[PDB]
Structure formats: structure tokens, C-alpha cells
Amino acid sequence: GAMNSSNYAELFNNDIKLFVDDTNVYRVTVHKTFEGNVATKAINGCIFTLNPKTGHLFLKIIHTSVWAGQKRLSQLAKWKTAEEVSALVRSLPKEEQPKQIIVTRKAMLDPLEVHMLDFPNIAIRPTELRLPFSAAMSIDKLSDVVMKATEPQMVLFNIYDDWLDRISSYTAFSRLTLLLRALKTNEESAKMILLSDPTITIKSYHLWPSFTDEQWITIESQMRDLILTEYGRKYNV
Amino acid sequence: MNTVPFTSAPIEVTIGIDQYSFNVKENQPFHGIKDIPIGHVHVIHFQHADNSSMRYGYWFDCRMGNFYIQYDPKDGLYKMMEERDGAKFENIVHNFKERQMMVSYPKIDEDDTWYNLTEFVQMDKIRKIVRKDENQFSYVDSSMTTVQENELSDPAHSLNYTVINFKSREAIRPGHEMEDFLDKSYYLNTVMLQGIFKNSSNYFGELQFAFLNAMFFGNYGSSLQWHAMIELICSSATVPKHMLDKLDEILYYQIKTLPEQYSDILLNERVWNICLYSSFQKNSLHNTEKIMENKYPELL
Numbered sequence: 001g002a003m004n005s006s007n008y009a010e011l012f013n014n015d016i017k018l019f020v021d022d023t024n025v026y027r028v029t030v031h032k033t034f035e036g037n038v039a040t041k042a043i044n045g046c047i048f049t050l051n052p053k054t055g056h057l058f059l060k061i062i063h064t065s066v067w068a069g070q071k072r073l074s075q076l077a078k079w080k081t082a083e084e085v086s087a088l089v090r091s092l093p094k095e096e097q098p099k100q101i102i103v104t105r106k107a108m109l110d111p112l113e114v115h116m117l118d119f120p121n122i123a124i125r126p127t128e129l130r131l132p133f134s135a136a137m138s139i140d141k142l143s144d145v146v147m148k149a150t151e152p153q154m155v156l157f158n159i160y161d162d163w164l165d166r167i168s169s170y171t172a173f174s175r176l177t178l179l180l181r182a183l184k185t186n187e188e189s190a191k192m193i194l195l196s197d198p199t200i201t202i203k204s205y206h207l208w209p210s211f212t213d214e215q216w217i218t219i220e221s222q223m224r225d226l227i228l229t230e231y232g233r234k235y236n237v
Numbered sequence: 238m239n240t241v242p243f244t245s246a247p248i249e250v251t252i253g254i255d256q257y258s259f260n261v262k263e264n265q266p267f268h269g270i271k272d273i274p275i276g277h278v279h280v281i282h283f284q285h286a287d288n289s290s291m292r293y294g295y296w297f298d299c300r301m302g303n304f305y306i307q308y309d310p311k312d313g314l315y316k317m318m319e320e321r322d323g324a325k326f327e328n329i330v331h332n333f334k335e336r337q338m339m340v341s342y343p344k345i346d347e348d349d350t351w352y353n354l355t356e357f358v359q360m361d362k363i364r365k366i367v368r369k370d371e372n373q374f375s376y377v378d379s380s381m382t383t384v385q386e387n388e389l390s391d392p393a394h395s396l397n398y399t400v401i402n403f404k405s406r407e408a409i410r411p412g413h414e415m416e417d418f419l420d421k422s423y424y425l426n427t428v429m430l431q432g433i434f435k436n437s438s439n440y441f442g443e444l445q446f447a448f449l450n451a452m453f454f455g456n457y458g459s460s461l462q463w464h465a466m467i468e469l470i471c472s473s474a475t476v477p478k479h480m481l482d483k484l485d486e487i488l489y490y491q492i493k494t495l496p497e498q499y500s501d502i503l504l505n506e507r508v509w510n511i512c513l514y515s516s517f518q519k520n521s522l523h524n525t526e527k528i529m530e531n532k533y534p535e536l537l
């Protein structure tokens with residue numbers, strides 16, 4: 001079944017589980033043609049596959065060549081995601097394979113179920129949570145490797161940098177989701193908040209800056225204020 | 238012509254014989270049905286006046302033996318049985334015919350309803366779905382489950398329809414996941430038609446038998462099987478043109494025969510709307526589409 005605010009602690013128990021977000025798989029820019037029609041131009045995308053307990057990110061880069069001469073591209077994207085996930089599971093040793101895969105959008109459930117028929121003990125599930133994973137391309141080093149890619153490519157990351165040395169996965173996940181929601185709601189302000197202080201820096205082997213515990217609190221506070229600020233701006237409050 | 242004799246009618250009962258229904262009163266001098274048209278399977282079915290629980294009945298073919306009905310007061314139902322003494326049988330039937338104790342199957346020479354609902358149905362295939370080999374006839378009722386239903390509970394008393402499941406390894410070739418899931422022609426033509434049923438006539442036979450079992454006994458599993466088999470054809474891009482033309486005719490007479498008051502439970506809105514307006518075969522069922530629109534526009 002579906003995942004929601006009642007069984008929210010399940011994410012951080014000891015059964016291996018992955019989230020799969022396909023929002024940035026198929027990406028297009030829309031422009032006018034010389035004759036005044038509209039045409040799309042695809043750009044590189046990525047499948048966002050994340051273990052919420054460990055912070056391991058399996059970033060499958062989707063090169064535009066994948067789409068060449070194919071029809072019905074938004075629908076193929078869902079089936080290309082399912083195939084990539086399935087191949088990833090199969091490349092993992094058995095004791096590393098997920099018990100559950102949670103998809104962030106319901107259209108992914110059938111493509112993934114069909115591709116995973118070989119894995120009848122792996123549960124494929126939707127979520128009622130609204131997770132801001134589409135904003136993963138607002139993280140500069142992920143955006144960079146995606147746009148630079150010349151070929152299909154799997155790139156591994158920990159989206160929690162070193163946080164788990166100091167906090168629980170439950171809190172790391174909360175922080176990540178709050179950071180990503182901020183970036184989705186107002187990316188430029190969100191980024192300003194992360195680099196407004198020029199003294200604090202991002203280690204070359206990390207994604208996010210090297211905030212002290214006390215500075216993370218402040219940052220977390222500023223992101224919540226941003227989301228709240230944008231809410232008011234939006235609805236006039 | 239042929240006949241099905243009753244020792245008696247001890248309990249008041251509504252008797253069905255193919256698409257005809259009529260009432261018998263407790264201990265009315267009823268001894269059976271005559272002039273049953275040779276050349277078709279038939280079904281004789283029952284709904285006790287006093288206990289609408291369990292519609293039940295018997296599929297039979299008069300060319301395979303002499304069959305009669307005698308009420309069993311222990312098990313509480315009208316049972317079908319075979320008389321092996323052919324001579325005992327004609328004698329008994331002639332007596333009741335002479336005394337006019339038999340109602341007359343009114344075969345009409347401008348009605349092809351029964352033919353059109355059982356064209357592809359053959360007793361030999363019925364007896365493989367309904368397993369009870371010491372009899373030449375086959376018992377069915379309201380509550381019998383299907384093999385597939387008993388996968389998600391006695392196997393002796395189950396309907397062995399051909400399992401269909403669109404999200405199974407049988408339906409879906411490795412490396413053709415998307416292709417086989419959006420276009421089921423592989424599953425229809427290689428797996429089912431060439432593989433399991435061998436030809437389209439045995440597929441249609443099961444499909445028709447399934448429908449009749451849903452309609453006459455309200456068997457929920459049979460209804461599922463009938464929709465599953467419609468959906469598999471409709472969802473395939475590639476179907477011999479002869480199958481589609483025939484399928485169109487089959488459904489038309491099913492839709493025509495269905496009681497109007499039973500359509501809310503025996504017809505699945507999703508399956509029909511998909512099949513008539515979204516599926517690969519949307520344009521291929523003109524006659525079925527016309528009768529469904531004009532008769533049950535509500536469902537669409």
C-alpha cells in the first residue's frame with residue numbers, strides 16, 4: 001500500500017528501501033520554429049534513486065541520445081526509469097537489494113511492477129507525501145554532472161554529505177526535504193541563504209556547505225521563513 | 238427431439254432451461270421438459286422459491302446419454318442423473334408425454350438466440366473446466382470459485398478457467414516489458430491462442446461459457462473471466478480480422494440477452510468503456526457499440 005504520515009518512521013527502520021523520482025528524467029525546452037510553430041529540444045535528465053536511511057543516491061544520468069527517433073516520450077520515460085531501476089536492483093548483491101521501492105508519482109507503479117516481476121518479494125508502493133525531489137537539479141554539482149554528460153552514466157553520491165556522524169537519518173531526511181522544498185519554491189533566495197555568508201564553504205567531496213550544528217539551526221530557520229514568505233506572497237497574507 | 242423427465246417436483250422452484258424461465262409449485266404434477274433441440278449444449282437451472290441462496294444447474298448434451306432430474310431430500314437439491322436402461326427411459330417418457338405432464342421447449346424458427354450464445358460451446362470443453370468425470374453432465378452454482386480466485390477453497394468444486402493476468406511473467410516477455418504490457422498481442426496470439434487454446438473457437442467457447450455462468454447463476458468468478466477474455470483481445474493491436482468480426486457478434490447477442498435489471502453488477506464500466514472507446518479495437522465492434530449505447534447509455 002501507500003506511504004504517509006502515519007507510517008513515517010518506517011523509512012528509517014532497517015529494511016532496505018529506495019525512493020524513485022522520475023520527474024527529471026525527460027526534460028525539454030520549448031521554442032518557436034522559423035515558420036512560427038513550436039518545437040521541443042530535449043536536454044539530459046536523471047533518475048533520482050535514494051536510500052532514505054543511508055543517504056546513498058544512485059543518480060542515473062539520462063543522455064538525450066536515448067530519445068532519438070522514439071515516439072510518445074513522456075510515456076517511454078516512465079518505462080525507461082522502470083528498466084534502469086530494475087537493472088540497478090539486479091546489479092546489487094542480494095543482501096543489498098531493497099525490500100521496498102517507493103515511487104513518488106503513481107504513473108510509475110505499473111512500469112516498475114512489470115519490470116520487477118522477477119522480484120516478487122520487493123514491494124512497489126506509492127506515497128501520499130509530496131516530496132520535493134524534483135528540485136534535485138537545483139543542487140549545483142548534480143546539475144553540473146547531468147548537463148556535462150556525453151553518454152549514459154551512473155554517478156553515486158551521499159546527499160547527506162557527512163551529516164549522519166552527528167544526527168539521525170530521520171533528521172537528515174527532514175533537513176534534506178526542507179532544503180529541497182526551499183529550492184523548489186524560490187531557488188534564488190534558497191541559494192542566497194546557503195552562500196550569503198562567504199566564509200562557510202562546501203568541501204569538494206560534498207554537496208552542501210560545512211555548517212556547524214548552530215549554523216544549521218539558523219539555516220533551517222531561514223529556509224522555513226523563506227517557504228512561509230513565499231506562501232504569503234503567493235496567496236496574499 | 239429429446240427430453241429431460243423429473244420423478245417429481247416436491248419443492249416449489251423456478252426452473253430454467255437455456256434462456257426460458259417458468260415456476261413450479263410445491264408438488265404440482267410436473268414430470269419434465271420435452272422437445273429440447275438436439276444439436277446444442279443445454280443448461281437446466283434452479284432457484285428454490287423458498288431459498289434464493291444458491292442458484293445451481295446442469296450443463297448437458299442430449300446426444301451423450303439419457304438424463305433425468307430427481308429431487309434429493311438429503312442434500313436438498315434437484316440432482317441430474319443418467320438412466321443407462323434406454324428402454325426403461327423411453328417407456329417412462331412416453332407415459333408422461335401421453336399424460337401431458339411435460340412443458341414444451343418452444344423452439345421458434347425465427348429465433349437464433351441460443352445458437353448465437355453457444356456457437357463455440359462444446360460439452361467436452363465444459364467438462365475440463367468443471368471436473369467431475371463419472372458424469373457426462375456438469376454441475377455449476379452461484380458460489381463455485383475459479384482456480385484463479387483460489388490463488389488470492391476446495392479444489393474439487395472449482396471452475397478451471399484459463400487463468401489470465403496481465404501483470405504476470407506469462408503475459409510479459411523479458412526485455413519487452415513496455416511493449417507487451419501496452420499491446421497484448423503476444424499474450425493473445427502466441428501464449429493463449431497458439432499455446433493454450435490452439436484455436437479461436439476454443440477461446441470463444443470458454444468466453445461464452447463464462448458469460449452464461451455469470452448470467453444464469455450470478456457466478457462472480459465467471460463474470461471476471463468473461464471480462465478478462467474480452468479485455469485481452471481488445472487490448473491487442475494485432476488480432477485476425479475474422480476473430481474481431483466474430484467477437485463483435487458474440488458480445489452483441491450477450492448484450493442483447495442480458496436482463497436490463499442485472500447490468501449494474503454483470504457489466505464492468507471500466508472494461509467496456511476501455512474496450513469500446515480507448516483500446517486498439519475501439520473501431521472494431523460496431524454492432525456491440527450500437528447496442529451498448531442504445532440500451533445501457535447509463536454505463537458510459
Ligand SMILES: O=C(O)CCS(=O)(=O)Cc1cccc(Br)c1
Pocket residue numbers: 242243244305306307320325326329330
Ligand atoms: O430409483 C429411483 O428412485 C429412480 C429410478 S427411476 O425412477 O427409474 C429413475 C429415472 C429413470 C428414468 C426417468 C426418470 Br423421470 C427417472
Ligand SMILES: O=C(O)CCS(=O)(=O)Cc1cccc(Br)c1
Pocket residue numbers: 254256257258259270340341342343
Ligand atoms: O421471459 C422468459 O424467460 C419467460 C418466457 S417463458 O416463460 O420462458 C416461455 C416458456 C414457458 C414455459 C416453459 C418454457 Br420451457 C418456456
